[PDB]
Structure formats: structure tokens, C-alpha cells
Amino acid sequence: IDNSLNTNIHQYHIVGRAIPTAKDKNPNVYRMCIFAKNDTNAKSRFWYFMKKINKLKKSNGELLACEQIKERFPLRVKNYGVLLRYDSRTGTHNMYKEFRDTTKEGAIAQLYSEMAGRHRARASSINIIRISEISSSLVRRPHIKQLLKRRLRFPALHLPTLQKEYRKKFASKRPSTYRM
Amino acid sequence: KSRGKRSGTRYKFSKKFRKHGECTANKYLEKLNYGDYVDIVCDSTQQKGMPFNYYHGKTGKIFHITKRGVGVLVNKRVKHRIEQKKVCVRIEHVRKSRCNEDFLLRKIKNAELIKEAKLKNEHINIKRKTEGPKPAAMIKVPPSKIITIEPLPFY
Amino acid sequence: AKSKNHTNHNQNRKAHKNGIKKPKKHKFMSRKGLDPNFFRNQKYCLKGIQKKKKELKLKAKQEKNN
Amino acid sequence: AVKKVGKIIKKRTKKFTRFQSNRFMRVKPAWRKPRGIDCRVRRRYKGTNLMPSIGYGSNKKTKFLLPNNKYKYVVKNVKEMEPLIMNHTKYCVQIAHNVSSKKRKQIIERAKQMNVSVINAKARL
Amino acid sequence: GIALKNVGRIKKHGRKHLVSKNPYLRLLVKLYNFLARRTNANFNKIIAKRLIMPKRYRPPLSLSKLQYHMANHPNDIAVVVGSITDDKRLFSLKQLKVCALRFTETARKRIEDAGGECLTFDQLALKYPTGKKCVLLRGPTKARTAEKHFGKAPGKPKSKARPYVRSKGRKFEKARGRRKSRAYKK
Amino acid sequence: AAKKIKTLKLINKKKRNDLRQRTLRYEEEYESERKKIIELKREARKNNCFYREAEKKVVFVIRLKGVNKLPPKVRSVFRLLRLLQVHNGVFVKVNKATKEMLKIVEPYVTYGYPTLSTVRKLLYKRGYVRVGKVRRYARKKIQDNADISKHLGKYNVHGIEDMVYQLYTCGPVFKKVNNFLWAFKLKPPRKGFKAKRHAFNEPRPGDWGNREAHINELINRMI
Amino acid sequence: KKRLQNKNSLTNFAVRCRLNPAYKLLRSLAVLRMRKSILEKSKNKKEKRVQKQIQKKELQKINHDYYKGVAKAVKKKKKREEKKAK
RNA sequence: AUUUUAAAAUUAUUUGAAUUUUUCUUCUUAUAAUUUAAGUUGUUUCUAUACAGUACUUUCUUAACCCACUCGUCUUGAAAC
RNA sequence: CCUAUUAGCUGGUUAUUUUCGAAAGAUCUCUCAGGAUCGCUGGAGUUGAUUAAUAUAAUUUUACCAGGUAGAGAUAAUGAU
RNA sequence: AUUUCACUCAUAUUAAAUAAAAUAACUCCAAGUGGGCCAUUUUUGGUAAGCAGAACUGGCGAUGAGGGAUGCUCCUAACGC
């Protein structure tokens, strides 16, 4: 396994409820599932969203079980869908999102680098909601249709990247850029 | 440049909405005893015996009782230390404290609980629980009753 | 020249240097001007016990010393 | 740096010199604590004439002993040698600077037959 | 970088070692330091602490006060770390045994012919090492004129401090601030 | 005199067998506790009737900032939490009062669930104990059970066995354990902090806050 | 008494056993499980895995209840969005 | 020189017991050792087979890498134009 | 010569190490370049603690108090509009 | 209201939590100080100011060390060898 390529997201699911009070003798139970860097980070994000959408926090919310309900097969190949909401330096804007990877864990996280590179939206400004599964033909994005084509090809004109072993400073002569 | 007796008391000594008028009839009907904790709350309707600038809303022991006045022992912080101060105010400006009723019922509880506990010879503690972590219990959440919610986008 | 008119800087730090002291909490306080005609009666109360105790002790001392 | 010879460890050599004693020349090199205000040596600025402190103090087990591994004792005549007859292997004798030649000879011979060692044995001869 | 009161060093207040270069007193404090260290006696500990006290904290004890203090147990031994002084106000003294630092000559003579005897602290250590049947006393430490000037300054309300004046006449420190007629009072 | 040596010799074997039987009892207790917790979680897995543990009643707190530029009440909270150096660590019993008083100092510490192996490591390799007399404590490494027995043997919690047996599950004696234990003087992290200036909970890298169960790695990296 | 070297209470076997009288028993008891031959685990792995069919089925049931709940929440979210779109 | 002892562990036993079921399974009845206890000891060379050097100790003078602004003082603030 | 007049003002004020260690607030002052006095500091001493407690705490919790700043309003009063 | 006799309210984890809480408390003698300044947050006058005047906290003064090339006040962090 290679640590450099991998992010640090795993599955979890923790269940609880708001505190049963004298006023609320029989409160209802609720749940929601997001992934983040850590289980604690995801719990904090969940409580922030609970405070923003409803009125409850740790002072009036408790949890009564915890489990790690991982995926059916992490080695699968998927196409899912989520909903993005973010803010710029002058307003707020929303859209949807879909991407392909092996599992939801990185499926959540491939988006942040693109957002930061393009719109300089720091991760504290983006909101992602309602993960589900998308179709392969329903996508109206330009790039993602050729992903599941019947047959496709392109060359490999990327520049070489050798090891620190063989990145020797003084070369006998100039290298080329064809390879293969 | 202005440090009068009632300076800066525009709102502190102002009478509350709907609360204008002299004190109620039986406000004069409180059994005050010596060494009794009591709050000192100014009543601007009564002018004699008015509590001074800083002691409004404070609490202190009763060290003096007169025919219509009360001497209250209130600790006041000045510079580098707290020192005792004896303030003599009329009884309309005095309201019986609610610090000792927290333990009055506790000390009645003692004479009925600790007595029976010892006479039957059990060990039971009485200190306040300062409850933090909730205990562990077996629960039954209904699969029909369980309902799901989710967050919301921008609008 | 102009002088610093006033500032509260460093003041409570100086206070907490030696700490905010508290009254010593003596058990008995003098009642020199505290509700006369009542503690005068208490003064009269004390002598009642004092006289009987003193006479009893003196009689016991004399009867035991012969 | 530190000197480590045998069990004797000296935490610092090249004894401290007075600040500005090099360029200023009525100022003797003997150390003096500089009071000043902006002296930079009391302020302990980097890389300038660090002051002596208590951290440099040598181990009290091996404090006043020489590289001889013995404590020095100065003597004026042969009548100050007796106390060394119980400590001939803990103390080394040293003649006083103002002792004459033949007195020096007659105490050096006494120290020799006493088997105690002398530091300045080759003086005035 | 540590957050401790006075860099985490415990500080003690008061005398550490006696500062009197009196050889017999030095022997006494050495003996009683040994006794306090070895025996578990708070009695010996207190005597060892009191032996190194300053002169103002070893006040004289009068014969009358000694007799009054020891009135309720005559067979016990009084022991004080100060001097014993004669009280002419006492008509008669009887059968008192007391150990003390110093005895005034008249008080010693009076104790002697009253039937008692005067013991020094070496004798007290010799025949009562653990302080059995020995009651230890001390004279009035702050009854001297020095603390009559101490406390609240003379001029504060309800201040009993004695001022520093040349003479106690009407012409000295009596007019303004010491009577209601002139400005204020006290 | 002559009887004294055998009198003191026999009590050694008496206490030895007493504590041996007690170690048998606590071994039985660890086995029973593990079986009970696992079976109570498996019962939750069985049906739609959940089970859990609440907040574990004990947290481990590590200071993160120095001794300069701190609010007075933050300094007081540090003082009465015994967190006085930059890399000090303590065990804190968890309740409403102490959790509230620690929330005011949260931006200068990181704290979380210690777990059993980590508490054992901390006590065994970094555990120091106040063996001296009251207010003269004279920090000393454990290295034995004699001092633990001297301070707690009359209170029958003598032994580092018992101290771990007691610190993990916060039983009736936490006073005489936490206060008896010297504040842990931890090393800097082997791999380093992420950002002491930012919370562990912000999306950007950060350190301070409640790591919950994620502090075991930090502790055994700092140990 | 004089201070000696603080022996590592985790790696020094003698001092660790002196601290924990049960440590040697626990270590030997675990070393026995380690010494248990590969044949036993090879024969018993299938039995242990097949004895947990009920447990994995119950876990699957709970997870599929979660999945159905998520799907129905998706359905309700879409119905509300469609209703309020016009 | 009247706790580097007691125990703790290990070895060689032995006693009985015990249970994970035994070649690092566990505990005393008893013994003898040893250290993993109870903060470093051992082997071989060299100094060296000399009375002071080309070595070793030290002083001094030169460089070199990094650092280093005149002190005293008034001052909130001095290297101060 | 009185006279080494006085100066709330300027400058100077001589060995080492160790330990503790500030204030530039306040009241009064023919006071505003000063002084006195509180406050901060050191030294000395006693009473204590030395009994993992009690006193105690720039901390929290529980219970109970007092407020009218932020905010909010013109249909709730005044002042506007 | 005071006094004296009875009984007795966990006191063997401590009438809530935590606490290098007695490094406490008190007294005496006395030095220096009594021109302050800066930073975050709040705020008054001013068009504004590295301006003038205030509140809280922390620093500079009185203090160096690593970093911000550079810098009395910024970040880390305060100092025996």
C-alpha cells in the first residue's frame, strides 16, 4: 500500500438522539451520514449541521451507539452523486457534484483540491450534502461521458519522474521526451 | 466631576414597568432574625433608608435589627482586598435571601434519611452527585419509530 | 507638560500580587452601639448565672477546706 | 569546552575577562559585573563576553585538588609539615615564595623522607 | 519554563538557627534539637524552637503568674523558656518546682526558701526527657511598650496605638484631631 | 528483638499470599469485564436495540502552549489542573464541572480517550509518584510497589496493578490515584505537531481540542 | 536511599515482574497461544467463519435497514424539491 | 562497617498442589547458585620499556565556520544625526 | 570674609557570587521636573500547617440573586420622520 | 437572647468538582516607585495621524534565545554549565 497517494477517510455510523426531557417525554430519533478526515471531525461537522438546521447541540444531544458500517466492496468502481454549497468572498453559490473513484471515502475528497485551485474556496467554506448514486448516461458534464466509453486511447507524453535513486545530477548527455 | 449619592442610577433605581407604587402590604411581614442572609434591593418609592450607590442587588448577613431598619454586613472589594461594610437600610429595601433555602430542605432530609440509614446500619453517601457521564443501560428503539433527516442547500 | 490623567492599568495585577484578602471572620463582634436596652438586658442575664455560680463555688471551697 | 582528565572534570577554561578590557585599556582584564543599562553583557546579547555564573562550579568531590589529584598546602618551614603525616597521599606541599634557600633545602629533604610530594621543588637552586 | 509560585521553592518564615554566640545556650539548643529529632515529643520540639527565639519572645514570667498558672496541679513541674522575676505583689509562695532559662536572684531565693527548687534545662532534659508531668508556659510576649505603638497608626479611627511624643503634657500632641473642639477627634 | 526478625519475616509471606489471591481476583475481574462488554455490544448487534458506553469518565489532557501571554483564569485553570509545563499531561475525571472548567482552556490543550494500553504505557514508562511527605512530595519514579503500598496499602489499592485497574475504570478511588501521580512530563512528538495554532476539528490541519479516541497515537508518539 | 538507574519497567523482565506479579503468567499464557500450531487454526478457521453466518446476516439486515432509510430519505428530499420547484 | 539485604527473574534440583495441557504452564516445603536484581564491567594493544621530543599537558600567536553596532547616562524608547 | 550660603535642577557615585524582586495607579498638596501617604517589594519575627485536610483559590458545578450594554422597535411610550 | 445538661448530624474518601492549597496568616522596619509605552478586543475627540484621551488582558520597561532578511512591543518560547 502507498501512503502518499491515499487520503485518510474511513467509514463510520454513530446513532443517538436529542435528550428526552420532561417537556419532551418521547423525543424522536434522527440520523445522517457524512465522511470527513476523522470520526471526531465528522461528528463535529454533524453537530454543526444539526445546530444550523435544527436546534440541538451536545448540551441537548446524546449518542447511544457507535459502529463502523463499511462498504460492501471497497474495491468496486462506482459513480455517485452529492450536492455542493460554498461561499466566495462576496456571496454564496451552489451546484451538484459527481465523480468516479473506488469508494465514497475518496469520492468525497477529490473535490476540495479542485475547488481550492479554481475558486480559492478554503475547506471551511464548502458544504456537501445528500450522497447517493448517479447514473452513467444521465451525466451532462463534458468529461465524464468518455470515462465509460466502449473503447478509448491517448498517448503518454507526460514528463518522466524518476526515483531519488536515479535522479542523478550530472548526466552523460541530454535525455529525450518520447519514452516507450 | 459628579459623584453624588445617586449618580449613575438612572436605570438601576428606576421603577420597573407595571411595578410603580409603594411596596405591597405584607412586605412588612417577614420574620427577620439575627445572622440571616438577606438580599439588599433598592426600592425607589421609599426614600428614607435607601441603600447606597454600590450595594443594590448584593447579599449579606444581618448584624443589626431596629424598629424599622436593618443593619446588613456586606463584603465589598476595594483595590487589593475585600473588607466588611455595615450598611443600615430601611426594611422595604431588604428582601429575604434565597441562598439558605437550598440547604434548609437538605438538612430536613438529613434528619429523616441519615437517621434511618444508621439505625438500620447501611453505608449511604449524601454528597451532591455533580452528574457528568450518563450510565450504561439497555434500550429498545423501534424500527418503525426511527426516522431520518438530512441537511439543506442554499436558497 | 500634560500628565497622565488616569489609568487603571496594572492595578488589579498589583492587587492579585498579594491576592484579594478577606475579612478575618471573628466569631464575636462588639455591639457598642448595637440595639441598646436589649444587650443591656443580656448583661443583666449574665450576672444572674454568675452570682449563683460564684456563691456555690465559694461555699464548696470553704466546706472542703474546713 | 569542558576538560575531562581522569575523574576531574573542569566545566570551563580561559577565565572570564572584563567587558571592553581588550579595546579599552585603562580597563583591567579582571572580571567585573557590568551594571549599565544598555550594556549588552548584562543583557546577555549573543556572542559577546558571557558572564560567570553558578553553573560553572566544579564538582565538590574534586574541587580544590590539582591535576596531582591532591590538595595543595603551602608551608613556611619544617614545623608546618607534621599535619601531612596522616595525609601524605591526599596533600601535596608547596614552599612559600619568601622562603630562603637553605630553609627550602631543609624542608625539601624533610618532605622527601616524609614521602609527601612537593610542587615547586626546583626553586632557587 | 514552569508555572510555579516563586519558582517552586518552599519558603519558611522565622528563625532558622540561633544567632546568640553563648556557648552554654548553643549546647542547650544542640541537646534539645537532638531530643526533638529522636523522641517524638512535641514538648521537646516546642522547647527546641523556643530556645532560639529572639529576646522579645522570651518574656519574663512573674512568680505570681507562675503560681496562678500552676495552681491546678502542684506536683507537676513548670517549665518556661524565659526568665523568672519576683513579684512583690505576691504575699506568699509555696512549693513550686520550675525550670527556666534564668532566675532573678530574689525570685530564686524566694523559690528556694518556699520549699521548691530551680532547675535548669539540662536537668529538665536529664530527669524528664519526654516531658512527663511538665507544663510549659510563657510570659506576656506582646505586653511590652513596643506593640503599644503597633497596629493601626495613631490617627486612624478607633486606634489605640501610642504615639511617639517627647512628653505627655497638654502642650504635646493633644489639640487638633484629638478632641472634637479642634477640627475632628481621632 | 530475636522474635522481631521472624515476626517481620512472616508478615511478608502473609501479605504476599493475600495479594496473590487478590491478583487472582482481579484477573478474574478483567476476564469478566471484557466478556461483559463484548457480549453487551453483541446484544446490540443482534437486534435494533442499541448499546454503547457514554463518555468514558476519564480523559487525558496535554498542554500545548507555553507559560507566557495567558489570561489569568486560563492560568488558574492550568494551575489547578496541574498542567504547568508546555508538554505536561494529566488524567482528568470527566464530569460537568471539570468539563466546563476545561472548555475555557481548550484552545491551549489537546485531550481525549486514553485507552488501556496507553494508560499502562504511561504509568509504566512515564509514571512518576509523589513519595515524599505532604507538601514535600519529592517526585520519584515508581520502580517498586513499596511507596504505593505506603500511601495506599491501608486503603487496599496497593500496587501498580491496582493503579491501572483503577485509573482506566474510574472506581471509588480517583483522588488518591490522580493526585498521588505526578504530572507526566512528555517528550515532543516523534513526527511532530500539525498546527498548534489551529483546532484539531477545523478542516485545515490543527491540534488543539478534543481528539477523542485519536489521542492514543499522539501519546505513544510523544512517550 | 541512594538513587539508582531507573530500570525500564516495560522491557526489564525482572523489574516488570516485580511490579506486576501476574505479568509472567499473562506473558507465558499468551506465548502459549502464539506457539499453537498452524494446523489447529487452519482446521478451525472454516468452522469459526461458518458459525458466524447468523451474526453476519443480522449485521447485513441492520445495514440494509440503514440503506433503505437513506433511499427513502432521498425519495422524500426529491419529492419535496419537485413539489417546490414550480 | 548492624536493607546493593529482603523479595524479582533465571538455572540446577526437590516437595506437594494446581490448572491453560505443558520442553520459556503456575505457586511454596526446602537447597545451591547466578543476574534480567542491586546506575559498567572484562580482554588485548598503545603510551612504554622515558626523564621531557616531532609525543602528551598548558600558554601565546595566527587563521578558519557561525556570531558580534561605543560604553556610562537621562529616557517608554540609544548603536544613535 | 559670612561661605563648604541655598538649589524640588544637571552630571558623577569605586570588588565578586547567590537569593528575592517592583512601580510608572491612587488621595492630598502655591501641586504638575517635587513631597507625603496608600498600593507593589525586600529583610526580620511569631502564630500556624507538616494529619494527600482544613484554612485557602483571578477555576468550575449546583441553588438563588441584580442589571438594561449588544441586539430589536416605531403598531409600546417620548423625540424625530 | 444567653448559659448548662441530654440525644445526634458521612467524619472509617472527606455535607459538590479540582487543586507542587500552609509557598498559609499576622506583625514590625525599610528601599525603590509615583514622566510610561505598545499589541488584540471595546471606545471618545479629530478628515486623519507612528495624534490626543479612556476599559480588559498580555507584553516592552526590567529580557535575553529560535524565527519574521532587517526591527524595544509580532509568532514560538522565557534563560544555571
Whether C22 CB is under 7 Å from strand J: no
For residue E77, count other CB atoms closer than 10 A to its CB: 21
- H or E stretch covering D8: strand D8-10
Is the separation of the CB atoms in B63 and B34 below 8 Å? yes
The SS3 of residue A111 is helix
Measure D40 CA to I34 C1' (Å): 33
For D92, left (φ over 0), alpha (ψ -120 to 50), or beta? beta
d(CA F198, CA F106) in angstroms, rounded, equals 11
d(CA F150, CA F134) in angstroms, rounded, equals 13
Interface test with B, best of C5, C20, C28 (most B CBs within 10 A): C20
For residue E61, count other CB atoms closer than 10 A to its CB: 24
d(CA C20, CA B54) in angstroms, rounded, equals 19
Residue of C nearest to B83 (CA): C23
> Cell 450576672, residue?
C47
Per-residue burial over A132-145, b = 16 or more CB atoms within 10 Å of its CB, e = otherwise = eebeeeebeeeeee
- CB proximity list for A91: less than 8 A, separation 6 or greater: none
- What would the grid cell of residue F195 be? 498546527
Q: Where are the alpha helices (DSSP H) in chain A?
A: 39-53, 104-119
The type of residue at B57 is G
| CA distance to A146, F135, F164, F184, G21, per residue, from F132 (Å) | 76, 8, 21, 17, 25
Burial (CB < 10 A; 0-12, 13-18, 19+), residue B129, is: exposed
> Cell 506568699, residue?
E92
d(CA A139, CA A133) in angstroms, rounded, equals 12
Shortest CA distance to B141 belongs to which of C28, E172, F49? F49
Please provide residue E49's backbone torsions phi and psi, each rounded to the nearest 5 degrees: -65, -45
> Cell 437550598, residue?
B102
| Displacement of CA A138 from its chain's centroid (Å) | 21
| Displacement of CA D41 from its chain's centroid (Å) | 26
Q: Crossing angle of helices E42-51/E23-38, nearest 10°?
A: 150
**DSSP β-bridge partners for residue A96:** A83
Is the separation of the CB atoms in F64 and F86 below 8 Å? yes
d(CA A68, CA A70) in angstroms, rounded, equals 6
> Cell 423525543, residue?
A27
- CB proximity list for A77: less than 8 A, separation 6 or greater: A100, A102
Whether D55 CB is under 7 Å from strand J: yes
| CA distance to D103, E148, E150, E168, per residue, from E172 (Å) | 78, 18, 20, 6
Shortest CA distance to B135 belongs to which of F53, F42, F33? F53
| CA distance to D24, D60, F98, per residue, from D15 (Å) | 18, 19, 55
Residue-wise DSSP of F140-158: EE-SSSHHHHHHHGGGT--
For residue A53, count other CB atoms closer than 10 A to its CB: 13
Shortest CA distance to F80 belongs to which of F170, F223, F178? F178
The SS3 of residue F73 is helix
Is the separation of the CB atoms in E100 and E84 below 8 Å? yes
Query: Reduced to 3 DSSP states, what percent helix, strand and coil does chain A have, rounded to the nearest 5?
Result: 20, 20, 60
| CA distance to A80, B53, F60, per residue, from B94 (Å) | 70, 15, 48
- What would the grid cell of residue G77 be? 428530499
The type of residue at C52 is K
Is the separation of the CB atoms in G17 and G24 below 8 Å? yes
The type of residue at G1 is K
Please provide residue B44's backbone torsions phi and psi, each rounded to the nearest 5 degrees: -70, -15
Q: In chain J, which nucleotides are within 7 Å of a protein Cβ?
A: 1-3, 8-10, 13-29, 35-38, 52-59, 61-66, 75-81
Q: Considering only residues 10 to 39 of chain C, which have any Cβ-Cβ distance to chain B shorter than 8 Å?
A: 11, 14-15, 17-23, 29, 34-35
d(CA F76, CA F84) in angstroms, rounded, equals 10
Instruction: Kindly give the pairing relationship between strand E97-99 and strand E77-80.
Output: parallel
Is the separation of the CB atoms in F138 and F130 below 8 Å? yes
Number of separate helices (H) and strands (E) present in chain G? 4, 0
d(CA D22, CA F64) in angstroms, rounded, equals 46
Q: In chain I, which nucleotides are within 7 Å of a protein Cβ?
A: 15-26, 32-33, 38-41, 44-53, 56-69
d(CA E185, CA D14) in angstroms, rounded, equals 72
CA gyration radius, chain E: 22
What is the torsion angle, in degrees rounded to the nearest 10, for the CA atoms of residue C57, residue C60, residue C64 and residue C65? 50
Shortest CA distance to A106 belongs to which of A69, A139, A136, A74? A74
d(CA A2, CA F76) in angstroms, rounded, equals 47
Nucleic strand I contacts from chain B, 37-96, CB < 7 Å: 39, 41, 56-57, 59, 79-80
Shortest CA distance to F162 belongs to which of F18, F5, F19, F15? F19
| DSSP letter assigned to residue E149 | G
Q: Where are the alpha helices (DSSP H) in chain F?
A: 2-46, 72-81, 96-103, 116-126, 146-152, 160-167, 175-178, 215-222
CB-based contact G9 F161, cutoff 8 Å: no
For residue A121, count other CB atoms closer than 10 A to its CB: 19
For residue F221, count other CB atoms closer than 10 A to its CB: 14
Q: Crossing angle of helices F116-126/F215-222, nearest 10°?
A: 20
For residue F98, count other CB atoms closer than 10 A to its CB: 18
| DSSP letter assigned to residue E148 | G
| CA distance to E47, E113, E139, per residue, from E118 (Å) | 17, 11, 17
Subunits with 3+ Cβ pairs within 8 Å of C are: B
Is the separation of the CB atoms in A87 and A123 below 8 Å? no
Judging contacts by C-beta atoms under 8 Å, the chain B residues touching residue A62 are 134
Is the separation of the CB atoms in F217 and F116 below 8 Å? no
Whether F10 CB is under 7 Å from strand H: no
Is the separation of the CB atoms in F198 and F206 below 8 Å? yes
d(CA D111, CA D78) in angstroms, rounded, equals 9
| DSSP letter assigned to residue E6 | G
Shortest CA distance to F183 belongs to which of F62, F113, F82? F82
Is the separation of the CB atoms in E79 and E133 below 8 Å? no
d(CA D62, CA D7) in angstroms, rounded, equals 8
Whether B115 CB is under 7 Å from strand J: yes
**DSSP β-bridge partners for residue B64:** B71
Per-residue burial over F17-28, b = 16 or more CB atoms within 10 Å of its CB, e = otherwise = eebeebbeebee
Shortest CA distance to G62 belongs to which of A75, A27, F49? F49
Q: Is C6 on the interface with B (CB under 8 A)?
A: no
Please provide residue E111's backbone torsions phi and psi, each rounded to the nearest 5 degrees: -60, -40
CB-based contact A13 G66, cutoff 8 Å: yes
Residue-wise DSSP of B88-108: EEEGGGEEE-SSSHHHHHHHH
- CB proximity list for E143: less than 8 A, separation 6 or greater: E59
CB-based contact A65 F201, cutoff 8 Å: no
The SS3 of residue B74 is strand
For residue F218, count other CB atoms closer than 10 A to its CB: 22
Nucleic strand H contacts from chain F, 101-140, CB < 7 Å: none
Method: cryo-EM
Shortest CA distance to A109 belongs to which of A145, A143, A84, A138? A84
Nucleic strand I contacts from chain C, 1-60, CB < 7 Å: 1, 3-20, 22, 25
Instruction: Kindly give the pairing relationship between strand B81-90 and strand A126-133.
Output: unpaired
Whether G29 CB is under 7 Å from strand H: yes
Instruction: Kindly give the pairing relationship between strand B94-96 and strand F88-93.
Output: unpaired
For residue E130, count other CB atoms closer than 10 A to its CB: 12
d(CA G63, CA G74) in angstroms, rounded, equals 16
CB-based contact G70 B149, cutoff 8 Å: no
- What would the grid cell of residue E23 be? 556557648
Shortest CA distance to E35 belongs to which of E134, E99, E126, E98? E126
d(CA F77, CA F90) in angstroms, rounded, equals 13
Please provide residue E77's backbone torsions phi and psi, each rounded to the nearest 5 degrees: -110, 125
Judging contacts by C-beta atoms under 8 Å, the chain E residues touching residue F68 are 1
Is the separation of the CB atoms in F200 and F209 below 8 Å? yes
- What would the grid cell of residue F175 be? 483522588
For A50, left (φ over 0), alpha (ψ -120 to 50), or beta? alpha
| DSSP letter assigned to residue A3 | T
| DSSP letter assigned to residue B20 | -
d(CA F215, CA F59) in angstroms, rounded, equals 10
CB-based contact G70 B148, cutoff 8 Å: yes
d(CA D121, CA D125) in angstroms, rounded, equals 9
d(CA A97, CA F116) in angstroms, rounded, equals 43
Q: Crossing angle of helices F116-126/F160-167, nearest 10°?
A: 140
For residue A155, count other CB atoms closer than 10 A to its CB: 8
Please report the number of interchain residue pairs, chain F to chain G, with beta-carbon separation below 8 angstroms. Answer: 41
CB-based contact G6 F143, cutoff 8 Å: yes
Is the separation of the CB atoms in A19 and A63 below 8 Å? no
For B108, left (φ over 0), alpha (ψ -120 to 50), or beta? alpha
- CB proximity list for D32: less than 8 A, separation 6 or greater: D18, D19
Please provide residue F209's backbone torsions phi and psi, each rounded to the nearest 5 degrees: 125, -160
d(CA F178, CA F58) in angstroms, rounded, equals 11
Per-residue burial over F105-114, b = 16 or more CB atoms within 10 Å of its CB, e = otherwise = beebbbbbbb
CA angle F185, F189, F194 (to 5 degrees): 130
The type of residue at E7 is V
Is the separation of the CB atoms in D92 and D116 below 8 Å? yes
The SS3 of residue B38 is strand
CA gyration radius, chain G: 28
Per-residue burial over D86-101, b = 16 or more CB atoms within 10 Å of its CB, e = otherwise = eebeebbbbbeeebee
Whether D44 CB is under 7 Å from strand I: no
In chain E, the DSSP E strands lie at 61-62, 77-80, 83-85, 97-99, 102-103, 117-119, 134-137, 178-179, 182-185
d(CA F196, CA A99) in angstroms, rounded, equals 34
Which residue among A62, A63, A123 places its CB closest to the CB of F203?
A: A123
Nucleic strand I contacts from chain E, 143-182, CB < 7 Å: 153
Is the separation of the CB atoms in F140 and F147 below 8 Å? yes
| CA distance to B28, B73, E133, F89, per residue, from B60 (Å) | 19, 5, 49, 42
Shortest CA distance to A79 belongs to which of A145, A142, A13? A145
Is the separation of the CB atoms in E149 and E131 below 8 Å? no
Evaluate the CA torsion angle E71, E75, E76, E78 in order and state its sign. Answer: positive
d(CA F139, CA F141) in angstroms, rounded, equals 7
Q: Quick one: resolution in A?
A: 2.8
Interface test with C, best of B3, B64, B70, B81 (most C CBs within 10 A): B81
Q: Where are the alpha helices (DSSP H) in chain D?
A: 101-114
- What would the grid cell of residue B11 be? 436605570
**DSSP β-bridge partners for residue E159:** none
Q: Which nucleotide is nearest to C41 (CA to C1')?
A: J1
d(CA C46, CA C32) in angstroms, rounded, equals 17
d(CA B134, CA B117) in angstroms, rounded, equals 26
Measure C39 CA to J3 C1' (Å): 15
Residue of B nearest to C32 (CA): B64
Q: Where are the alpha helices (DSSP H) in chain B?
A: 101-119
CA angle B93, B99, B104 (to 5 degrees): 120
d(CA F13, CA F8) in angstroms, rounded, equals 9
Is the separation of the CB atoms in F56 and F75 below 8 Å? no
Is the separation of the CB atoms in F203 and A37 below 8 Å? yes
Evaluate the CA torsion angle B141, B147, B150, B152 in order and state its sign. Answer: negative
Please provide residue B90's backbone torsions phi and psi, each rounded to the nearest 5 degrees: -75, 160
